[PDB]
Ligand binder design. Structure first.
Ligand SMILES: Nc1cccc2cn[nH]c12
Lengths: 642, 645
């Protein structure tokens, strides 16, 4: 086997073709070079199906001869998507009597020898920089006779150097082919004789956590409904009294009510604080909004999946309206209008006409609190009754009745339950991302990114609830849904340690149950890595943890812990911004460089790497770390010949 | 002073406008958000001129109402370009009363306060990560009255955090509108009465290396001609004694001839090996190919400029056909044919048709050693006479002579002087960049990037010399000419230590003369930093140095030094790549983690950071480090407030 590449499109063609969805050029080759606006990667045809990775393609259509081809297969768990190959497209054929000598074809048309080590793994005969494999996701692993064994999806790394590859095996594709593309998940399942995890995909208004738990209780079962929102959990208790004549148990941090009833509503956080499942307590457990990828929900759901069976439950329902891989569809009640540039109010490069928001109750989503304060002011500058809401502020600042423009972050989503006449959406969110930067250890960085379909649908769903609404937007873009960053795993161990008195080992068991359960949001498996680093964080200063807990910023454990190390070396923190405010009083005694454990923000002080905890975390970085490497458009091909 | 942004084009419109060069949207506001295909940055209108940074725009045209607007001003040394603003567009105007409280407008419409600290520097009241400043190049620094003080060009960094900003002062924009828009430099300068540096920009064949120095020696001056290429240098000497009747002195490694004549032809390397200017010797030094950004040339030219006046010369001539900022333009003898996907031979995503290269003598430029060998091994399969040439092979592997298709890297253009029927250009090359990555120290990475105007020009220029030629290519366009990376500064210090017995302080004096001389290729001024690193690299093993020098690969001092530190700790090298072959002998005795000094490639072994030299280099990374932050197209704007703050 040998290979070379042929480019068939340039920038301009690729953008035009991506907008229209019409690709006229004939699909030749078996390995295609594909591209979205943000990324380029590979697609491989097998058994008449053009396959690639979910983390590159998302749920996007493939531009084709008669216009956009919508995906025939999507499996977020296998990181696999497929489109029916356009008429007259070659296919590699599956490899059955497989060799251990495989060849990986990259986007540079290189043919890299790989030695197979298991269903999904292969060692590179000669290790290479991970940068060299990027853009080759979705290309084939070939057995010696040129038949397909799988498609490449991730490199396995030691300190930035790829030594092994992870792939989606051909058999998994055949399983996905023989799976039903359409499955009915809209009705509540019947309670089985032995334990089952089941999925409920249904709009908000189906009664996922009002009607369906009502109905279960009527058949004699005890039901626990978990929700990420306090305001929503509290609110179910009133509604269920009015609407179904059940006064349920309510468990939040701010407020608990035990009536002895057969239905309990809890936060995930309060469920965690109470130590998880009581044996005997519940028959069914409904995990509502299980699309939610915040650390408390993930840890919470992970706890239910580890413990439920053994505490006597027979049914776990994983419930959401926006499951992984779902796409934003029209809402009959909601008119959608792109923002233009003619308007009095500037808003993320577009404009809001004052007429759109003068009078009425309206919600404008902003990515940051700084922008909420900004817009809430510029709107009082024009005589609108505006109010900012974000983490920290009390929800009471939002008037329950009367005109208002609420300028809010996603904190709104758990603080406040009401709806609005309209929603205006900046279409972006602030996210955290881990870089394995080895300078000295890892970095957690905050970025602004394009929203995904879950965020778009949750934001838009603040209007149109049983009455007509308007959704105005800055951009129609929408990144793939149902994935989250390894930094969310870090947060889970952080919270396990800071709040729920979980050991890292204990936290691993729960997260492992989450990862290994299909049909939930997905993430790189880095449990060992993160467990290993929290295990060495011993003897934290109780007093520092206390302040970082109460200040309520992110990574209270890792921050407090760095504080601890700095304070025991009478040394300053990475910097004097608010992150390290738990240390302001000790300032005048603190001198020299910072013994840096990791980077959670800008580091303005000089640093030393000689602290034994820094050396422990640096040793932790030698772990195997699996990293990944408008219509989708074919921009070239890789022609295959030994 | 407050600001907000307006987006006026998306991706599709932006590509269409960059190709047509026609933009009808009217130009509102003072501060435009502009884009190329690869980057995005700012551009600020002052006094009817729309200004931005050379490192962003290159010599590119701006899309305007009637079509592409050519640049009116191009000053590579100030990193400043300017297009005549369309009629009716708003401009800012200079600050009148000299405030020191400044405001930087970023591409995000943030306004950050800056304290003026010099003609072109100002410190950030709140130090910020450089990432937040990227793409704000070309933005204004405003005084409190909203008037223009300069444009932002770079951030001064300690360990990744911006603490100061560098800007092009509004004076330098007056200094620029107060001069002619066209200059000559097409003629050899007359010899002045006292020392002067002059530029000569003339086509190849002008006889810039043959005809002009003969003239100067006719007037009875001693002249030295420095060239990067040993082949070109022997070729000028051999050409002189024939078509000119002077047997010039020749100085090269392979061949040195002292005839006593008043013309001398040398490479920059032999000149450096000779200890530069031997006082009293020459009146005129011609520095040919002063566009070359190889380390030997930069160091030679720098030596000439530091030493020539004090050694009694009256004229230094900086000579090239492709000066910084120069655009490629059609050559009347050469027809340029875009390759397509149709052809028997796959070539960088495109294809070359056989008919196009079967008869005659042709040159195919490929980016690497391995692509040449593959493309030769293939072409000789199809049955053509194909030889590969690249660094480490003999110039004579080429025939003189028969039919031939030579498949070469850029090494060709120092090793070999002949030309061809057609040239096929992949239009990419290999470059080294440094990354201040703190993992633990710095990284020198090799990447394959798009060629620049100089490279296209010299590659094309191997066809159609006074006859006819065909130039075939994979891609149009160029990145800007006349800029080189900080890694090249590192190479000069390395070469100074390894080959030319220069201490780092001495190397700094030569490179400083080069940076400070205008009209030469430019680079970020990282002299103090690199000097510090090399000053700490003491007691190198002479045997390892001698092997890395002879093997001919890059950074032989940095490699030998890492090898030295490893051998002395009985530790393994970072990997067992070819780069570390001077340690192969010792492999069985070497154990444990490598004391890593810096990253020159993949590091596969475990690493320890406790070695004293590692810490010393880590400490050097606290130095102030200045980093930079189709038609150009306007894709948005930043509206500044009219009253109050
Ligand atoms: N589709 C996916 C994206 C990112 C990570 C993972 C892990 N399994 N599937 C994944």
């Amino acid at each position: 086997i040998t290979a070379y590449s042929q480019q068939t499109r340039g920038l301009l063609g690729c953008i035009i073709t991506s907008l229209t969805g019409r690709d006229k050029n004939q699909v030749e080759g078996e390995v295609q070079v594909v591209s979205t606006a943000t990324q380029s990667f590979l697609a491989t045809c097998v058994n008449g199906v053009c396959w690639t990775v979910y983390h590159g393609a998302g749920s996007k259509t493939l531009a084709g001869p008669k216009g956009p081809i919508t995906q025939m297969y999507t499996n977020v768990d296998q990181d696999l998507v497929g489109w029916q190959a356009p008429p007259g497209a070659r296919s590699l054929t599956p490899c059955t009597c497989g060799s251990s000598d495989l060849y990986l074809v990259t986007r540079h048309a290189d043919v890299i020898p790989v030695r197979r080590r298991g269903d999904s793994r292969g060692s590179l005969l000669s290790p290479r920089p991970v940068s060299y494999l990027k853009g080759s996701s979705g290309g084939p692993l070939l057995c010696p006779s040129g038949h397909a064994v799988g498609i490449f999806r991730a490199a396995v790394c030691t300190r930035g150097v790829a030594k092994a590859v992870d792939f989606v095996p051909v058999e998994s594709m055949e399983t996905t082919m023989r799976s039903p593309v359409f499955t009915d998940n809209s009705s509540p399942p019947a309670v089985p004789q032995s334990f089952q995890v089941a999925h409920l995909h249904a709009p908000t208004g189906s009664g996922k956590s009002t009607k369906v738990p009502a109905a279960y209780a009527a058949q004699g079962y005890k039901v626990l409904v978990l929700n990420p929102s306090v305001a929503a959990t509290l609110g179910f208790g009133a509604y269920m009294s009015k609407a179904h004549g059940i006064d349920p148990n309510i468990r939040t941090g701010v407020r608990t009510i035990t009536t002895g009833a057969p239905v309990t509503y809890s936060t995930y956080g309060k469920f965690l604080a109470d130590g998880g499942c009581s044996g005997g307590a519940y028959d069914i457990i409904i995990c509502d909004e299980c699309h939610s990828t915040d650390s408390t929900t993930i840890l919470g759901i992970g706890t239910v999946l580890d413990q439920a069976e053994t505490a006597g439950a027979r049914l776990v329902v994983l419930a959401t309206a926006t499951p992984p891989g779902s796409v934003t569809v029209p809402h009959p009640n909601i008119e959608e209008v792109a923002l233009s540039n003619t308007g009095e109010i500037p808003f993320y490069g577009k404009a809001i006409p004052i007429e759109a928001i003068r009078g009425g109750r309206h919600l404008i989503f902003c990515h940051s609190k700084k922008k909420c304060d900004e817009l809430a002011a510029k709107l009082s500058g024009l005589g609108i009754n505006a109010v900012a809401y974000y983490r920290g502020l009390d929800v009471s600042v939002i008037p329950t009745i009367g005109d208002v423009v609420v300028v809010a972050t996603d904190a709104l989503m758990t603080g406040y339950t009401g709806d609005f006449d309209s929603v205006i959406d900046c279409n972006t969110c602030v996210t955290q991302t881990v870089d394995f930067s080895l300078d000295p250890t890892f970095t957690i960085e905050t970025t602004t990114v394009p929203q995904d379909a879950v965020s778009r649908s949750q934001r838009r769903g603040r209007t149109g609830r049983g009455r007509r609404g308007i959704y105005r937007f800055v951009t129609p873009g929408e990144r793939p849904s149902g994935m989250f960053d390894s930094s969310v795993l870090c947060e889970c161990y952080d919270a396990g340690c800071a709040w729920y008195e979980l050991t890292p080992a204990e936290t691993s068991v729960r997260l492992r149950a989450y990862l290994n359960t299909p049909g939930l949001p997905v993430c790189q498996d880095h449990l060992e890595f993160w467990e290993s680093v929290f295990t060495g964080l011993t003897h934290i200063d109780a007093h520092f943890l206390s302040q970082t807990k109460q200040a309520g910023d992110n990574f209270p454990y890792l921050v407090a812990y760095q504080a601890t190390v700095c304070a025991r070396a009478q040394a300053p923190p990475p910097s004097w911004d608010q992150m390290w405010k738990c240390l302001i009083r000790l300032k005048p005694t603190l001198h020299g460089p910072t013994p840096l454990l990791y980077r959670l923000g800008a580091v303005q002080n000089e640093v030393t790497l000689t602290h034994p905890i820094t050396k422990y975390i640096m040793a932790c970085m030698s772990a195997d770390l699996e990293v990944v490497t408008g219509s989708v458009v074919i921009v070239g091909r890789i022609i295959l010949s030994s």
